[PDB]
Amino acid sequence: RKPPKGMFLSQEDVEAVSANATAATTVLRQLDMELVSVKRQIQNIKQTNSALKEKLDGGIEPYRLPEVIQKCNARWTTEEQLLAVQAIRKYGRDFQAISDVIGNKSVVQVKNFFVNYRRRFNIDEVLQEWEAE
C-alpha cells in the first residue's frame, strides 16, 4: 500500500522517466543544471551583500546622541506650549513624537493639550494643513 520509508515513487515521476530511453538522463540533467544556476546565484548575492556589509563599517556609533532623562512634569510653560504647535505642524497626530520632542509631557495629556487649547491655538487649522503635506 505504501513504499518503504525513504523511497520516493510517484506516478508522475514514474511516467516522467519511462517516456523515452534518455528521459531519465534528460530529467536528471534538468536539475543538475538548475542546481548550478541557483548555486552561483547565491555566490552572486553573496559578493553583493559583502559590499553592502562593507559600506556599514563602524555602524552608527559616532552619530548617536545621549538619552534625555528628565522627570515628566505637570504644568505647561509657554515655551513648552509653543514647541507643541510646531510639533503638531510637523507631526500631524503622532503623539509619541510630539511627546518625544517636548521631553516632559504625558503622551496622554498631549491629547488633553490638543483638546484644551484647541481653539486658542487654532489646532484645527494647524492640523488640516499638516494634512495638506
Binding site: M7, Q11, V14, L28, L31, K39, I45, L52, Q86, A87
Partner: protein, 666 residues
Amino acid sequence: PSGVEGAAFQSRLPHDRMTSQEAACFPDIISGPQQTQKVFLFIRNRTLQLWLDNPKIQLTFEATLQQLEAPYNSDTVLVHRVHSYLERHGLINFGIYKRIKPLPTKKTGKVIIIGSGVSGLAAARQLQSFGMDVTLLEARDRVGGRVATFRKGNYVADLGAMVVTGLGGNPMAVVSKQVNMELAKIKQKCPLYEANGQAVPKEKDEMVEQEFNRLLEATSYLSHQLDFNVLNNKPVSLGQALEVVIQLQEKHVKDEQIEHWKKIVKTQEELKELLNKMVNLKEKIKELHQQYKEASEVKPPRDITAEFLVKSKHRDLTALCKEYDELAETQGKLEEKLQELEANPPSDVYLSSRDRQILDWHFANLEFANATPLSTLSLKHWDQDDDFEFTGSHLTVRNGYSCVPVALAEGLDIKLNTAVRQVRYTASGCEVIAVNTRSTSQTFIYKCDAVLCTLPLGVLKQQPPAVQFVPPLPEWKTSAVQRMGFGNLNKVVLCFDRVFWDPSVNLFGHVGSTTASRGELFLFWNLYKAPILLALVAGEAAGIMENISDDVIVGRCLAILKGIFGSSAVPQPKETVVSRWRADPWARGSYSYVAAGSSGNDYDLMAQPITPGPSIPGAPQPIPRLFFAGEHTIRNYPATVHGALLSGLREAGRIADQFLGAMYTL
C-alpha cells in the same frame, strides 16, 4: 509444528483443509459432512506420520490399520482408499526402502523415460514400484543429470546442485534418512572483499545490504500498487524496475538539494534587502546629524522656532537610530539562520561509485539465485514460488550430491550413452529412436505404451531441434517453451594441497570492478573435507565466460585470491575443473526462471501430457501417451533438485492412474 499436524506440514500439505488433489479422488468426502472430512484428514495425517517416522521400510496398508486408533480404524475401506492414494502419488513409500510385499512377477504396460536425471529416476523407481516395466534412456555415461559430482582421489566437489534448501517440508529430508548423506549446515557469515583485496567495513557491508532489500520492496510496490507491468507494449523486467527505482532515488536527492539551496537564496535575498535598507537609513542618519550639529550652532537663548528645530532633529535622529537597531537585530537572526543551513546540507549523492559496486554484488547474488541477468526476469512473477519456501537452514552434501541419484539408480534398467533423436507417439503407442553417443552409427528402436520426457528445458528449446517430436508438439506447448527462460550458472573448482583461508567461513565474496563483470567470480565456497575452494560465475558473465580457456579462468581466480590472502599463501592448485552448462548438449543451461512475458502458468502448461489424434478417422479419442517431468514442470518448486524429484513422483502417479486405473475414486 509437530504431531499428526507436523506430518502434513512436512509433506507440503495443509493439515486442517483438503487439497484440490484430494477433492478429485474423494469428491464424496469433500462434498459431504464436515465430520467425515475431519475423519479423513486425520487418517491422512496419521499415515503420513507413520511413514515419516520410519522411511526405511514399506508402510503396508495393514501395518497402517494395525497402528491406527478407533473410531478411525473402523471404516477399513476409507483407510485403504486413503493409504492407496498416498502411495500412488508418492507421499509415502517413495525413495529407497525395504519392500514388505514383494515385486509382482508379471509386469504391466511399458514406460520409456528419457533422461536419468533426478526427475527421471524418481518416476522410474515409483513406476517399477507399481509393477510397470521401465527403461531409462540416458545420453550421458552417468546417471546424474544436473546433479554432477567431481571425484578425483579424495577430492569431491559438486558441479551441479550442491545445496539442500532446508529440511522443513523438504522431501529430501526423507531421502537423507534412507541414503547415507553427510549433510552439513552452511554458516551464512559472508565477508565481502573489494577489487583491492581489503574487506568491506561493517558500516558499508551492512548499510548497502539494507538498501538492497529496500530496493527490492520498492519494485514490488511499482508492480502491485502502480500496475507498472507493461511499458510501450512490452512487459517490464526486474532489471528495468530496479533502475527506475534507482533513478527516482537519484532524482529525489537532487530535488532535496535544490530546495535546500533555494532556501538559501530566499534568505540571502532577504538579507540583501535588509542591508540596502540599513545602508540607506545610515545615510539618512548622517544627513540629520549634520543638520542637528548645524542647528546647535545657533547658540542660546534662541527663539522657539530655533529651539524647535534643534529639539525636532534630535528626536528624528534618535528614531532612525531606533529603526537601525531593529535592523541589526533582524540581521543577526538572518545571518545565523544562514550559517544554520550551510551546516545541514542534505545528502550529496544517492550512492557513491563505491557503494554502487558493493550493491552490484548483491545484484550478482540475485542473478545467481535465478541463474540469469535481471533484465530477463519478469518483474511481476519472478518470485511466485517464494510462498512455498522450506524452513530450516541450508546445507551441503559433504560426500557429493551425486550420492543420491547413484542411490536411486540401483535395480533400474538404464541405457547409458543412448541419445534420443526422435519421439513418435500415436493412438496405438510409442516408439523412441535413439543412437549410440559413442558411434552414432548404431541405431535403436524402443516401443512402449508411454514416454516420460524429462529432457531439460534447454534441450526442448534448442533450434534446430535436438529431438524431433512426431507429430510435432502443439502450439500451446511449444509457445510455453519459447516463453519460459532457461538460465545459466557456472562453477570453478580449485583443488589445493593446504587450507589457506578462514576454515570456519563457509563462503566469502569478491566485489567486481564494473557492473558488467558483477557476476564474474563473485563468490567462493568452503564446503568439503579436502581443501577445496569453489567459485561462482553468474549473470551476464556466465555465458561470456564459456568462451575463455580454463587457464585464463583459473588465472583470474588466483588473482582474486592473492589480492585477499596475499601472493605467498595461495599455491598452485593441484586439480582444476570449470563447467559450461550452456555448452553441454544435455543441459543447454543450468535451470529455469520466470522470464519477462511468462508466468508460473507456463510451468503448468509444461506438465500437461499429450494425447495424440486417432489413427483411424472416426475412432474415439485415445489415452495420453507423452508425459513430462523435471524441474521446468513443477510450478511451486522450479529450478531445484527437490522440485525435479517431486515432478517425477507426480508423473508416476499420473501414468500409473492412466494405465493401471485409479481404484480409490469409488
